[PDB]
Design a protein around this ligand. Structure first.
Ligand SMILES: *[C@H]1O[C@H](CO)[C@@H](O[C@H]2O[C@H](CO)[C@@H](O[C@@H]3O[C@H](CO[C@@H]4O[C@H](CO)[C@@H](O)[C@H](O)[C@@H]4O)[C@@H](O)[C@H](O[C@H]4O[C@H](CO)[C@@H](O)[C@H](O)[C@@H]4O[C@H]4O[C@H](CO)[C@@H](O)[C@H](O)[C@@H]4O)[C@@H]3O)[C@H](O)[C@H]2NC(C)=O)[C@H](O)[C@H]1NC(C)=O
Ligand SMILES: *[C@H]1O[C@H](CO)[C@@H](O[C@@H]2O[C@H](CO)[C@@H](O)[C@H](O)[C@H]2NC(C)=O)[C@H](O)[C@H]1NC(C)=O
Ligand SMILES: *[C@@H]1O[C@H](CO)[C@@H](O)[C@H](O)[C@H]1NC(C)=O
Ligand SMILES: OC[C@H]1O[C@](O)(CO)[C@@H](O)[C@@H]1O
Lengths: 537, 146
């Protein structure tokens, strides 16, 4: 009936969803709001829907939290963020579409703070708190998505809003003493020429060595070393980008570390289908947690026909990696509670050239699988072409039927029994240079043969992974009917994808480990769990 | 000559120019206005395609037409009921990518619906080509707003 609806990913009962909104924790209860069209399978009439959780996995529905109810948001309630004030009170800053269809920034706060589920929200008669006008000269059609606010050393709040001027992307900074009167700062927190619109900006601290989250307003003590992360979703490319840098508190400006530029050349959280992502600080278990919207890769006709569009990926804890060159992401550990009690284990199998090994006894369309690969002869790896710089484009031209020294090896997920349909999540290993000991690990999510229906967007994804192939290669896949979430190298490379198979559904989907490279690769360990369904809104 | 330069950066300069000049909103209109004019042009053709498709379904079609004719009907129903209204909302309120999504939607549908016919000239091929070409011009115009 609905073979592509997910078993444990967040999505509403029906209709269009996009950006996650105002993720927060309050009185030990997680809140996710999200952009939702109450009466269609495409974007429009957008309101904030609302669901609550105590584990980030099972979700209880609530009435729409924020919807048009006043001039300043009469034409729509667009994206925004929750800030937890020092006294413990949550407030929401969000973009409203006003009566002249200009984008403006409004505040909402709880109607009853004793209500843990914060079902009803009221809005200030002073709204909008921040808006375009003749003096600031901000572009009224490119001025949205307020961040969580952070309290500076001088007791004045900061908040940034995504914007642009011509081809230049902006993170417009506003400051405030009381959180009601906001004043525009002359210079923005950062900008970039040529990037285009900066949608859904995020700005947060991270500790230099460690995996715990840092409270957004937390300072770097004469012991503690914090970097800051600026994230932007770019209109232009439909992807999410981040740079690692320092936060000049004197200038109130963000300086990306040498090598970083905040545009399309920057690194991504996810190298597949992933947009409008937003973090929040989970004070209950000390971790920053990242929400991400994954839209459909089916046709709009298929969307309208099935009656829904859009999912959230599984929430992932994030932190700075040891080297400080990238962020590491990993699905929140609560997702592991869905894992069936009886794991399927393979250990010490040799996938010779051209082989595949099927993994039996698992609900293959709804599963979590972790695998370790060990290559024996690294020196047999092919020298990468120095002009091959774009990992996605490599995966596109070198498909799984094209052999190399090391790889393709990995998983074939959501596969039919006779492999009429399959999604390949695999590795290739290249030698960085001739006679070198440095190696390049490529990760591909190939969905060229994921479905017999051609209407589906069957674009392939790629990403290089900063891991030493001398050590075993890690690979985790969350599988859920129409979504595959892949994590290379224990979270250093993430690729979310959407697939819609005709044969590989429910009991008729299968799971294979495989190797089509010239050399043989070992599978040190392969754990495949069936995943139970979550109770979701 | 916002119109002139806007139309230079589209897949069909002449179709673009013809369309924008037929709507007085283009004399003084910015790029968002020019995009809305294009959506109207697509809506005007997709309406005709839709009405044409009804006739042939209420007139005993060949066996190899029924399968296409039902798909085309649904395709243009989605274009007129979901895609274009979305694009009008996105352009008017300022989220261009959802207008872009809507334009890429109708471009593929129009082509798809055309290609369902073997011998490869449908009874309303002009309308599919018009809806395909206008949707591509529309995409180009909206790229500017990203
Ligand atoms: C959510 O909504 C949708 C998800 O479906 C997203 O929309 C877009 O999604 C992708 C971008 O990721 C767009 O994909 C492009 O589609 C083209 C395919 O068109 C048809 O399909 C077949 C494919 O076999 C083909 O025969 C014809 O082209 C058909 O017309 C592709 O042309 C295009 O592929 C090129 O680019 C990709 C990278 O994006 C490469 O992987 C490919 O190899 C290919 O590269 C080309 O150029 C390079 C030079 O750079 C050459 O070297 C190559 O040889 C080759 O020529 C791509 O796959 C999709 O079209 C688009 N759809 C819609 C409806 O908008 C949207 O982004 C999502 N939104 C959010 C917020 O997440
Ligand atoms: C919105 O931002 C500014 C608002 O002033 C616009 O800048 C003007 O652009 C027009 C071109 O249409 C010029 O005639 C003016 O001289 C510009 N003024 C300044 C101060 O630069 C800008 O064009 C608008 N939006 C975008 C996307 O560029
Ligand atoms: C506020 O909510 C709490 C818990 O939901 C409830 O006990 C209380 O009666 C509510 N108060 C009002 C004024 O609605
Ligand atoms: O629902 C509209 C919202 O979607 C976005 O364009 C990002 O996907 C935001 O900039 C906007 O607030």
């Amino acid at each position: 009936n609905q073979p592509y609806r997910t078993g444990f990913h967040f999505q509403p009962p029906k209709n269009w969803m996009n950006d996650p909104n105002g993720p927060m924790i309050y009185k030990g209860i997680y809140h996710l709001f999200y952009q939702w069209n109450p009466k269609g399978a495409v974007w429009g009439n957008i309101v904030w829907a609302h669901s609550t959780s105590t584990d980030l996995i099972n979700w209880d529905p609530h009435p729409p939290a924020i919807f048009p109810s006043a001039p300043f948001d009469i034409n729509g309630c667009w994206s925004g963020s929750a800030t937890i004030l020092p006294n413990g009170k949550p407030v929401i800053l969000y973009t409203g579409i006003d009566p002249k269809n200009q984008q403006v920034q409004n505040i909402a706060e709880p109607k009853n703070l004793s209500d843990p589920y914060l079902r009803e929200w009221k809005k200030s008669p002073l709204n909008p708190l921040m808006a375009p006008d003749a003096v600031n000269g901000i572009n009224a059609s490119s001025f949205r998505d307020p961040t969580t606010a952070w309290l500076g050393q001088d007791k004045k709040w900061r908040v940034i809003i995504g914007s642009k001027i011509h081809r230049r992307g902006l993170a417009i900074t506003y400051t405030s003493k009381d959180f009601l009167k906001w004043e525009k700062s002359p210079e923005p927190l950062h900008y970039d020429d040529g990037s285009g619109m900066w949608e859904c900006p995020d700005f947060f601290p991270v500790t230099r060595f460690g995996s715990n989250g840092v409270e957004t307003s937390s300072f770097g003590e004469p012991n503690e070393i914090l970097k800051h992360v600026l994230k932007i979703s770019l209109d232009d490319t439909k992807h999410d980008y981040y740079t690692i840098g320092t936060y000049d508190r004197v200038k109130d400006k963000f300086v990306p570390d040498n090598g970083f530029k905040m545009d399309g050349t920057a690194p991504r959280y996810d190298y597949g289908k992933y947009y409008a992502s937003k973090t929040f600080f989970d004070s209950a278990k000390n971790r920053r947690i990242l929400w991400g919207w994954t839209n459909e890769s089916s046709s709009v006709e298929d969307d309208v026909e099935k009656g829904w569009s859009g999912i959230q990926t599984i929430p992932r804890k994030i932190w700075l990696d040891r080297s400080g060159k990238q962020l590491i992401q990993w699905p929140v550990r609560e997702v592991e509670r869905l894992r069936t009690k009886q794991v399927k284990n393979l250990r010490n199998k040799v996938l010779k050239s051209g082989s595949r090994l099927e993994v039996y006894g698992v609900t293959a369309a709804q599963a979590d699988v972790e695998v370790l690969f060990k290559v024996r002869d690294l020196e047999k790896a092919d020298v990468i072409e120095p002009s091959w710089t774009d990992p996605q484009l490599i995966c596109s031209k070198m498909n799984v039927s094209v052999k190399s020294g090391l790889g393709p090896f990995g998983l074939m997920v959501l596969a039919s029994k006779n492999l009429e349909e399959y999604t390949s999540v695999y590795f290739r290993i290249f030698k960085a240079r001739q006679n070198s000991n440095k190696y390049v690990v490529l990760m591909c999510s190939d969905q060229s043969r994921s479905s017999l229906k051609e209407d589906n967007d069957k674009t392939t994804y790629g990403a290089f992974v900063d891991i030493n192939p001398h050590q075993p290669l890690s690979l985790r896949a969350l599988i859920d009917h129409s979504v595959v979430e892949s994590f290379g190298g224990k979270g250093r490379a993430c690729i979310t994808s959407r697939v819609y198979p005709k044969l590989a559904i429910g009991k008729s989907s299968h799971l294979f480990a495989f190797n089509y490279g010239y050399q043989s690769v070992d599978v040190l360990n392969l754990n495949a769990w069936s995943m139970n369904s979550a109770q979701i809104s | 000559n916002l119109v002139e330069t806007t139309c230079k950066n589209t897949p069909n300069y002449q179709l673009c120019l013809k369309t924008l000049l037929s709507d007085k909103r283009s004399a003084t209109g910015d790029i968002t206005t020019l995009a809305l004019i294009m959506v109207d042009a697509i809506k005007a053709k997709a309406n005709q395609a839709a009405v044409t498709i009804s006739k042939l379904r209420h007139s005993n079609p060949p066996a190899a037409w029924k399968g296409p004719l039902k798909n085309c009907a649904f395709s243009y129903k989605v274009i007129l009921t979901a895609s274009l209204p979305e694009a009008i909302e996105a352009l008017t309120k300022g989220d261009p990518k959802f207008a872009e999504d809507g334009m890429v939607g109708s471009s593929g549908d129009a082509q798809e619906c055309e290609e369902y016919f073997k011998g490869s000239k449908s009874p309303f091929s002009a309308l599919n080509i018009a809806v395909h070409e206008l949707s591509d011009v529309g995409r180009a115009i909206v790229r500017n707003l990203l």
